[PDB]
């Protein structure tokens, strides 16, 4: 989950009453480029300008397109907002934004625009799935997270493929997306397994978790007692907390 604030270097609200006024030094160029054939301005252009900057590191690391950001802002807020942006050639990556043109056709303006900013920086949701804080990538050396296939000899071969581990969980939409393995994907959280995969995946999953924490120290407890605890918890048909 990448909010627009993560890739935004800094923000400045400007007052430019005219499009070609351009109080900023650099902006005049592409401003005039878009206003040689200005389109969707027929109503009128709001004097309040919102100029945000985008760090090229955060932009290229996530494979972000300026056009994509314009599509997500203009799509999220609709036609009430106007997006203008640089080509990547600009060493300073700029995104200019203006209030609805047909709004000129309460809340004041600058206050409404500040509310727009503080709503975007947190709210936008450019990429990914919200509630996922970070995603970690590694090649596991443990045989449990390694994909082990039977080869043509019937032998067991252990393969190294990249795996992800996320901070924070939303199981369903991660399962839904493309290239993610539906079969072997699992979370440690029991409830998010319950409301998605049901009570049986909670049986086996809870079982694997208890076995993980109990056998992590190096200790060994027999299978039967774990298998009983999971059954007594899941017997009633839904999760029974022990409380």
């Amino acid at each position: 989950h990448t909010t627009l604030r993560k890739v935004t270097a800094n923000t400045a609200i400007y007052y430019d009453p005219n499009p070609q006024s351009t109080v900023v030094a650099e902006d005049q160029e592409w401003v005039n480029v878009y206003y040689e054939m200005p389109d969707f301005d027929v109503a009128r252009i709001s004097p309040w300008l919102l100029r945000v900057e985008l760090d090229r590191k955060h932009m290229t690391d996530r494979k972000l397109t300026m056009e994509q950001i314009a599509e997500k802002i203009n799509a999220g807020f609709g036609d009430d907002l106007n997006c203008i942006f640089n080509d990547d050639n600009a060493e300073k990556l700029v995104l200019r934004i203006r209030i609805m043109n047909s709004d000129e056709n309460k809340m004041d303006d600058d206050v409404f625009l500040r509310c727009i900013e503080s709503n975007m920086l947190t709210d936008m949701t450019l990429q990914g799935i919200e509630q996922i804080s970070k995603v970690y990538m590694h090649l596991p050396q443990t045989d449990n997270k390694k994909k082990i296939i039977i080869t043509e000899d019937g032998e067991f071969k252990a393969l190294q493929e990249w795996i992800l581990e996320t901070d924070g969980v939303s199981l369903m939409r991660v399962l839904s997306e493309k290239d993610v393995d539906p079969v072997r994907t699992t979370s440690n959280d029991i409830v998010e397994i319950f409301t998605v995969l049901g009570i049986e995946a909670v049986r086996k999953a809870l079982e694997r978790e208890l076995y993980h924490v109990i056998s992590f120290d190096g200790s060994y407890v027999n299978y039967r007692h774990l298998a009983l605890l999971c059954d007594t918890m899941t017997c009633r048909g839904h999760l029974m907390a022990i409380t």
Binding site: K146, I148, Y223
Partner: peptide, 9 residues
């Protein structure tokens, strides 16, 4: 038995 653990009780 995937992963081929052969130690069985």
């Amino acid at each position: 038995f995937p992963t081929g653990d052969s130690k069985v009780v």
